[model samples]
Target: TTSVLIRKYAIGDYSKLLEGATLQLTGDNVFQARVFSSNDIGERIELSDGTYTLTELNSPAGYSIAEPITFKVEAGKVYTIQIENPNKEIVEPYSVEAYNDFEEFSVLTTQNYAKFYYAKNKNGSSQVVYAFNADLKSPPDSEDGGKTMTPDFTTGEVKYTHIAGRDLFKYTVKPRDTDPDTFLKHIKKVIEKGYREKGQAIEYSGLTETQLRAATQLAIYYFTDSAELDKDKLKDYHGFGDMNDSTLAVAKILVEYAQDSNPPQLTDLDFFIPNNNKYQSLIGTQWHPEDLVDIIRMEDKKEVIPVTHNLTLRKTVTGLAGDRTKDFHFEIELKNNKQELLSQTVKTDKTNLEFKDGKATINLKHGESLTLQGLPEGYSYLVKETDSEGYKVKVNSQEVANATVSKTGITSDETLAFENNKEP
Candidate 1:
């Protein structure tokens, strides 16, 4: 059974109409289903007492109706409609009518409908263009009392209407009799057989299968990068590339197609590596060094081992402002008794290593010094200037006073001199 669903914004506020808004399925088999956005120039909607049909809508300029597919959705299956290919037939946009409960299945927000679509349509042969507010409402004459009353989808001015006799695809959902694990295993076997015989299907169809696959793939794509890898140590990290090729292939498919892949059939293993540290668990999330515990050097340690530091420092992120994710280098330098640079270990932090969200704080203790090189102007290493509440790096690369612990400049032997008498 499916649960109730809602819509939320993609950025800024948790608003339904905010840009990047998307539909969230709760209380049901959202994990088992999929969602998609289309741009068929003109699609029609048809809904009977318990049935719906989406008729041929116009397609984008260069494409036509690939095929007329059908979907059998249960009471709570959520679907978002987008602009379709030029000259392609489209299914009608319909409303949700929970069995015996009509009011709960209202119209999905416009922003939510456009979330999976690509914003700019500057190129040709692309799946989505100008992804934002787009929905279907009742026409002027039918008066069948559909989800909404009028249909004008400008950013703020919402015009909706409830007409009748539209042809949207109707789906009949059924509860599975077999165990979920067994059922999933059976489905996977079937899918594998089909893929082995034929390359995975990527045709345009509004069929329930296509809908479900697109939705799942979008979620997986948002969760991780397709090309992330981890190193066990210096040589091991360098050699970890070939082992991750399988993961890269799966990830690439998810990211490349915004809503064309099915997430459910792909095992959790397909979604991400088990206990992965190479990628962020959620998209658009970040962390700071301060949020982690500092592995202090023990008194007897003569060399800095790779095991001494957390492996999480190697991942980097860019695109805070736009499309580019800046790759900032993270490194640890070890010094020997002669004050020579013994070894320097580097990791990749997102383009801007300094996080403003107090959640990621940077601390330098008595002996350790932080050096940050290669960042855009105005963004240096993380340090609290006299004026700001957050941290910034000194671009001139000059030594700054340690904020966490004072610079004692004391050697290990001298520091332990007072305690020498207590030792054996």
Candidate 2:
């Protein structure tokens, strides 16, 4: 007879995770016995005849619960967890895919080590994973007098993760080993503008517990998924809800891109990256106040086609329709290239709804193919619709954009002339 008792472990106390954010176990298992989350190997929990192995589930950014791999648990033998640090990876629920297993665990930092931080900009929708140092140095890490988490982190790697159009930040913090008061004094001193006041309180009363805990081991700190600056300059950044789907789901892709290439363009201060100006220039006609959605669909050939749409407001004056007035807006996009200004229009005044009244209408069909012309370099000339519901469209780079729009009109390319002049 075999029964499995599955227990979830996290980076911090399980109750604390209820406040928000927790890490999930993944990848190689260090437990000596077969460990499987369930029946599946992906997240399975495997145990062979009461044989248990002590292993660490691991992720890149946090302490290795997988380290110090020790001990094997045997059936009918009492097994105990001295400290539960599962080999795990940081898991932000609310993604397209979420794992319901696992829980949070806690950790402490050693002295002489500082953690790294990467923040998400609310306005820009971009992620920033940079290093920060707890110690003071000749050069400052944070923009203000605040202390940062990184000093010298892994090369070619961001200390945190970033995603565009979403808000989420993930980083690590290592503490220095010393008396809590002494370490807290160091932290307090750093906050006191270099401890210049000799013994003045720096108004950072929040550090009260942190300062106390600094005596034994280093503690990791976190802020809201998105930090906001209060009106008072005396105060520092504050956190909000735990990293969730609404905040972090958008950043996963952005973080990957930033980690592989150069850090994303934060401000126009640097000339190496693509800035708002470049993005504006790429798509002609400075984007108006009317919110615009840039549609990117991949064709069957795997070429990415671009579509730029311009939406404007329209109104009806008092007339036969009860002498009343009504106002609404419509969307008209050009499908040439990412930079469609270079090419002529493909679909003009295309409505978002189907109008059986015989006019250019927007059809909300699943798997429709449409492509414009004149995009920037590195972009293809086709896009295919993969999914859509009402006003929303999900396009992939799998289908082909068969329509060919020239200076005059859109043609099938196989036809020599316009459809209006086609001869039977």
Candidate 3:
């Protein structure tokens, strides 16, 4: 009689006990031994006494068939063999996503170290490993930071992983040891501004706990070293979300690209890196250099100056949508607080003001004025705008004259009205 115990192991765990596995016996006697089931202890196979060859038929997922084994079964004796099918090998091009440590923010700092251990050797070493330094001073080594686990520095090369949840690599990072109080101070500041002062809170609504913790780590990095005025100031600069994402993901990529001699434009800003090879998008258009200046000032507790606000101008043609082919031109002028007039002319047919400057030109502190002139004849002013806030549009001299008119101390962009309609 012959018996065999067939089992499948996945990731060092007994994944499945193969129920129906067929084996072929060839020699003086050609027959089949069927592994019927596992009662409680093991599987039972039936065979006669003879020297036979055993060949596997099928295997479970993540496993493959093994080589045939030849064995002899004696009368009144049982023969047993355990056929183990190992897991398939995983190839390279692995990516690892960083998790948020504080609610929804990532706390991964440049001072921390990240390592990949896809495959383990007999000595507990890995074939894939990497380290990151915020300073980008040099490549990472075993002695860079205090080690909690020993890494084999001689066997592998490290690759930079960016963008969350895009790759197959397992990630673990050694955090930079810093004072706990420093971390608390920044969080308290954010809370005071977002929660206590206004309805705004560090928008942790969609972020995971690990991401939030990671963001907290970044706040610690920024505020730990030199004390700042208020955490609120930093929040206003990076809009909290971008600040967190940039610190956790964008900054790492920036450093890697810089070291590889292929640095990207606008390294200090945050951008989204997706899995596919598409162009990365900058976080938002609301960013400016003054934000950086204010951040520095806040850190030093200096008198922070207000940054200029950006307003966009929109143009649309109303009345008789079919008359879109009819073109019109207007001369637009923007005046500063000191009455300095900057002028530009725009036309409906061929125009690039919106693309060139986002259709905004005023950096007013208090308020500024705008004047519109050069309206073609046979066209009367029509009230078609419904979305202009804190702005008014009117003809210079009532229903007719069409004289030169202006809005005083206008702080936002405004679109005027014109139409070639009969006196109705």
Candidate 4:
């Protein structure tokens, strides 16, 4: 069975429209579900595997009938479908629900969505570019030291007439017949060690690998004058030409896209080996770095994972048996790292529960507890007791037992207990 929830959001507040809409499911499986019902944060229907269509029937709440939605559900999957009530003022755009795929293949995110990008260019098609002489983002203050190396389309040949030991940030290489691995590793190490001294790490993490190798190939492309690097023993030496070919393919993407950043922090950019044609073709004949605009390509794995987690929030009163019968008031809040109060449905059988404005307040006597169950993964939480007339309170948090921590919050974990005492 799948726990499929359909909820409503108005403006930016989801809690504002707690009870204003209903959806009629018409398809392989047929049934009607009301949103924001009495049982949980929103109304959830238990449906087995099948294709289903939902249509907005009637509303006197000044809310518009949302466009009918059709989707499929697989056994054992949880879905959080959110529909916008256009009758209410609009803020940001509305999106489809989040489904976490637990199968053999996938990856995902938290309540608010996030994404990343990468770009790659091809060679032999006759394209060449280079990095700046000095790092510019940091500036001796610094991608300006970088310049475009123009190649002749005729012989497409770039032959070097003479050989001189050249300097690249304190290290010199004659570009002679050195083994590819040793030479490439040397180039990678020199760039890294020098930048390491400057104290700022590369822009992207593991992607930094692309930057080191990418820049190396670009440098070789600039220094070489022959169309066939294979003619030199350098290409046959094992990995030289092969590695540079791959690096330049990965490097140009960094040099071109991040050009606006200056001196090109290739490491901070996406290192890739994706299709070259899936990218730019500048001039109808040839253009700037590239114009295909594949850099804007976005990877939306829309795999919304809702791993039902159960966290129990309890209140402890000690300091020598502090008032056990007294009902202490506590405020529970769910939010993103942004600190904006967020609303989520939690499972609890406890009483004195009042939720509003993205927060929940509950009255629990000593040793009493409440729980937040049945929500997505990676959300921020803060559980605090309102100040009492005569007591000192300290909150000791417990990291979650079964799941790896994801987002940031004021508290450390789900094993949270709010403690207070009348003495001292």
Candidate 5:
């Protein structure tokens, strides 16, 4: 009732080496099928010269199987089948919104990866130490695109990869009652030095430091506490406008300050409550901030929220004796506080530098240090008397002191200015 036919074609990028592919062809019932291994060109299998369902039994690495294909073969005709597989280099739009209960308080980011540290003290009047850190990385078009994780309190990096979704990232970290005062101050200092100059309106801009702290405390209450706060109780406070807005504004100030510059301004403050209709339509009503501890401990959930941030690098030189027209060369490397190289070495000059480029930008995870290293030859470096209006500089992972050559990195975006000064 049928004759023999062969099918042949390659999958995925043709230029790259391909292997470990098994193809199959099926007919009406059991025992009426054949499977074949594909070579560089493709595979050849015997089938009746009629209709057969073609499928991929197994695909090569880093590739998805092609869709089911049905083909027909005539009496004495040979047909060549060609299917083009898509490349997996695309990133999806990922965003995180931090909430205190009723309203969205802080906006995280949309970058591919980011990280943060949690500090706590032990054994009385001792110094505060980093207890744990959370990280998230969601690469584009990946099977495990969204991932959120908490690195061990002892070590800064996560030894194994976790699969957490972007939506449930913050919820994965259980809330702790440990005092955030020191941490809050640390973030406040970063904001005053970095963000205040940018002219972004801080909700507590005019409030006293004590008043601001009180406002932040309330915000944390809404952020972690499950009980709905009464609107009338919060109406008397200006900084606590709707309580959620005020606290988030305060958090925005700290988060923006702790990182670098050029982040999206805090504008839309949308809250995600577990029982709310908004996120229920997006995710289900089953997950909420209260379930974070469970989400972190659960192994059944495969999608993990990834940590990420946009890091920028720049360089400047003064009093140069030679060519000023062309680009100069400087070798830059991204490292951690431990002096461990986290990224590849970049040998480039300060001409049209940008954070979007893989060369000048580093997407860092939590607790990993990002130290930029580079210098020009023969030129002496000078530490500026004061920080520039919108930025600061560092060298060898420490704040510089009148030292000339410099490289700086932060969790946010900003220009790196490396200056080589000349003595009069």
Candidate 6:
């Protein structure tokens, strides 16, 4: 006869017996087993050697069925089987979101020797959220601040994951140790901020236990994650979520992007790797460099293309060498769709230039030119030159009034040329 010892226990605890649970043991033959209060040490069930499955038939209140296990049993061989049931008391759930029309499937990272974090930002200040990994779907590991549990961690190549954003920061306290590591850093900080002054009485005090009282073991220290200031200065800069859906299901955080009018404001987006992987974006007449979504999915892409514009002012002389001897005065004005007079400084290292209002005056000799750089797409401009004796201004070789206007159209490469001619 073959004997198998089947046992039940709560997650992480194997010392107690849980009675009144039912199980089905099936093979070439099927057998039913139940636990009564005390004598149910898996009564050395007898069976023949064959392929078999040990499955949970029912769980008591507050528990859920764990996956079944299949195995081969041999006659005369004693075996022990252990199964686990998950309880509801150990789970804390969170939610995930996207803001600012955030698009594209979101981001995930895998760092070998390390854990994960989301660098959440608001109003230029930030807080980091602890995240999990593919291996975190189980109870204890599923909690916040769960690590990837890299096999052979000390021997694996370490990849420090990074989050790319404008104003996020790093927070390094305990170098990724266990629960005690976190509390240790906080104790140091609390003391430094004069926490002692806040409470001089040992209002709530206890001896430093376990770490010193234990021969060899694990200690569950009273711990709090970190702090607001610690969040502001944490070294855990890995921004995105976990790459595996299992871990992401446990980690919920919002991914957002910042947008502004024109020329897109840029601070610093981090490089997640020492190499590849970061948020991608675009620019326009007006743009907000932001958005992220999806778990690297087919619907995860956001279409954003880049665009910009500018103008050139040029001067030409004709008919006589005398026409080239004197400088000509020119004025330019730039206005937006709001019809607001934009105060802009336009100067040339080549000649005298002065800007007083939205419109500025510049002196250009024959063959002189100036260019306006980084102009946003939608705006109107006017170029008018000063009148002079024996010299009349012609625009683009067309005899016209001294003023040239672009209320008509905008060519990013638009150029206004002024010519003066004098006949001898």
Clashes of each: 69, 68, 22, 20, 36, 15
Error of 1 at 226 (Å): 13
lDDT of each: 0.22, 0.22, 0.29, 0.36, 0.31, 0.36
The TM-score of predicted model 3 comes to 0.18
Off by over 4 Å in 5: 1-308, 320-323, 335-410
Q: Give candidate 3's error at residue 219 in angstroms.
A: 6.0
Model 3, span 296-382: residue lDDT tens: 000011112222222222233333322334333333344533454332332332233421221223211111223333322222222
Candidate 4 or 3, higher TM-score? 4
The sequence of per-residue lDDT tens digits that candidate 6 reaches over residues 70-157 is 6655554422343211111100111111011111122233433122122223233222222111112111111222223222233232
Q: Candidates ranked by lDDT, best first? A: 4, 6, 5, 3, 2, 1
Model 1 regions lying over 4 Å from their true place: 1-113, 119-213, 216-414, 418-424
Runs with alpha carbons beyond 4 Å of true place in candidate 6: 1-306, 320-322, 336-340, 344-357
What is candidate 1's local distance difference test score? Answer: 0.22
Q: In candidate 1, where is summed lDDT lowest over 10 consecutive residues?
A: 414-423
Backbone clashes, candidate 6:
15
The total number of steric clashes, by the backbone 3 Å criterion, in model 3 comes to 22
lDDT (0-100) at residue 217 of candidate 2?
A: 16
The global Cα lDDT (0 to 1) of model 5 is 0.31
Better of 3 and 4 by lDDT: 4
Q: 24 in model 5: Cα distance from truth in Å?
A: 21
How would you encode candidate 2's per-residue C-alpha lDDT over 306-423 as one tens digit per residue? Answer: 3322222222222132212211122223333333322212333342332221222232221222332222232222212222111121112112133222222232221111111111
Please give the RMSD to the true structure for each candidate, in Å: 26.6, 24.3, 28.8, 22.4, 26.0, 29.3
Q: Supply candidate 5's per-residue lDDT for 230.
A: 50
